[PDB]
Design a protein around this ligand. Structure first.
Ligand SMILES: Nc1ncnc2c1ncn2[C@@H]1O[C@H](COP(=O)(O)CP(=O)(O)OP(=O)(O)O)[C@@H](O)[C@H]1O
Ligand SMILES: O=c1ccn([C@@H]2O[C@H](COP(=O)(O)NP(=O)(O)OP(=O)(O)O)[C@@H](O)[C@H]2O)c(=O)[nH]1
Ligand SMILES: [Mg+2]
Length: 292
């Protein structure tokens, strides 16, 4: 087993002050721009937003979301029934406006286009800025204009595909679980993140447990497994996961399946590998060996 004080150290949160100033910096850049078709909202997502950052110097995940228009899953007839009209302002236009705003503020050398994000070197931390449009997921019987689930969506030009995320729901649901576990959920995420990273530093696979997938995996664990001590939490969580049916796990946003064939999803075999390494870490810590 792993000593409690070691697990408790692994549960510590990295500083967030520099990350908040990174967020405030991006927001100030966009506040200075003259927006032709709606001013986007700017919020954080990722570990800093969810209080699961294990360092204070990791990249800041920023969402820049246009809400004056929305993409959706409606058919043309359903859009008509709701009185929606086509926006002539596209995701591409909005992206170009966001990029111009950031470039005007930080300088061209500090703003560059990534695969899925605009990457910005601020005077604080690097920011990964997701430029997205509000997404409305309507139910299969589409009857009322207000009955939808809100996410966001963005285009990936190098892959000719659209991504739909639900970061606000990811945050809301993680906070709710943290409330209901008497605040053990987020420290437990960080404990496992630091345990994973400790193993990666010693030579374990780089993709042993990508942070987002690890949060989603732990989100599916019953609240009763979190609490008491970190030692009891480590074992109760891991022992439950070893016996669980992973196939029906949902992401923390409550909408998507965690495991599947799409590029946003994980695989059960990778999840099982993570559990094996945590098992070995636990049983391996206090044990002596010798050559056979
Ligand atoms: N496969 C994926 N599917 C849906 N959303 C994803 C995603 N990967 C990343 N994201 C979104 O981008 C956010 C930040 O991505 P990452 O930085 O890779 C995870 P993180 O929680 O910030 O851990 P970190 O502390 O190692 O940075 C995630 O919290 C999520 O909102
Ligand atoms: O579904 C997603 C995937 C990714 N992201 C955000 O995109 C960033 C990169 O996501 P990524 O590292 O998984 N993809 P990558 O090929 O490295 O593209 P890029 O790094 O942009 O050149 C991540 O750090 C997230 O902040 C989302 O917001 N939603
Ligand atoms: Mg992050």
């Amino acid at each position: 087993p792993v000593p409690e004080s070691q697990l408790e150290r692994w549960s510590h949160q990295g500083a967030t002050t520099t990350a908040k100033k990174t967020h405030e910096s991006i927001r100030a850049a966009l506040d200075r721009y003259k927006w032709p078709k709606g001013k986007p909202e700017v919020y954080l997502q990722g570990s800093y937003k969810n209080s699961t950052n294990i360092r204070g110097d990791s990249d800041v995940d920023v969402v820049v979301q246009l809400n004056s228009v929305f993409m959706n899953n409606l058919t043309a007839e359903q859009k008509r029934r709701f009185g929606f009209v086509k926006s002539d302002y596209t995701w591409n236009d909005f992206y170009s406006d966001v990029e111009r705003a950031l470039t005007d503020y930080y300088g061209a050398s500090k703003v560059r286009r990534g695969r899925k994000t605009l990457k910005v070197e601020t005077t604080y931390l690097p920011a990964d800025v997701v430029v997205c449009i509000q997404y409305r997921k309507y139910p299969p019987n589409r009857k009322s204009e207000d009955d939808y689930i809100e996410g966001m969506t963005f285009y990936v030009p190098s892959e000719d595909r659209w991504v739909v995320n639900y970061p606000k729901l990811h945050y809301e649901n993680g906070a709710a679980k943290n409330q209901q576990t008497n605040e053990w959920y987020k420290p437990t995420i960080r404990m496992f993140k630091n345990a994973r990273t400790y193993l990666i530093e010693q030579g374990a696979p780089q993709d042993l447990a990508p942070s987002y997938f690890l949060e989603c995996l732990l989100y599916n664990v019953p609240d009763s497994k979190f609490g008491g001590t970190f030692k009891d939490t480590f074992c109760s969580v891991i022992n439950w996961l070893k016996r669980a049916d992973l196939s029906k796990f949902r992401c923390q946003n409550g909408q998507d399946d965690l495991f599947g064939e799409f590029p946003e999803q994980w695989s059960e075999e990778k999840a099982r590998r993570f559990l094996r390494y945590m098992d070995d870490l636990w049983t391996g810590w206090g044990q002596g060996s010798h050559h056979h």
